Amino acid sequence: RKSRQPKVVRRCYEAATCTFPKLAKTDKYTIVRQPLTTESAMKKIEETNTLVFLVD
RNA sequence: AAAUUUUCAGCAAUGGAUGUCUUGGCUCGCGCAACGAUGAAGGACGCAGCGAACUGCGAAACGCAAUGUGAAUUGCAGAAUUCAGUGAAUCAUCAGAUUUCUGAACGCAAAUGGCACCUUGGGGUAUUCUCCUUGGUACGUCUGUUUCAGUGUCUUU
């Protein structure tokens, strides 16, 4: 059984001398949206060393 | 005679008829031929500076690029620069892009973001380890290719 080897590429990101490679879908920024700030969340930051964030 | 009941008128109440409107319907006629494995129709969940819906859109999310028009949008806010301009707009046009999870729906599934394997590129005593990361692996069918099986018919080394 031969592995695939599909002659000519499907999508043009992955080619010889492409040089504009694909920018990422999930960056670090789109994971970690924003911190929470509330009465409940700010109590933790002092005492238990603990940050709260809203994430994807 | 009051009061009450009934009747007629005036004013007030209750109610939404009549009249006048109408960016909607209905019917007739005339043109045009253009959905989908290059992922359709339909579904789900999201996205606005301040939105629930309805329209619009898809992590590039009431939009981006291009072209045309050439100064707004508007409920408030802000931005004022964008103002003899390589340029305002819930503008028109639209030939370039994005297009989550789905669905014929396609790795197995399914009241489950469940359970696999292969693969690219990188991250942490290891060829077998775990991790992030890129893209794959359904069915039928045609032409070609490669690898086979059959004391099928034949020669024969």
Q: Which alpha helices (H) appear in A1-56, and where do they start and end? A: 28-31, 39-47
- Cα dihedral angle (A12, A17, A20, A22), rounded to 10 degrees? 50
> Which nucleotide has its C1' atom closest to residue A1's CA?
B147
- Tell me the resolution in Å: 3.2
Whether the Cβ atoms of residue A10 and residue A19 lie closer than 8 Å to each other:
no
C-alpha count within 13 angstroms, C-beta hemisphere, residue A18: 11
User: Collapsing DSSP states into helix, strand and coil, what is residue A33?
Assistant: strand
Q: Is the CB of A16 under 7 A from strand B?
A: no
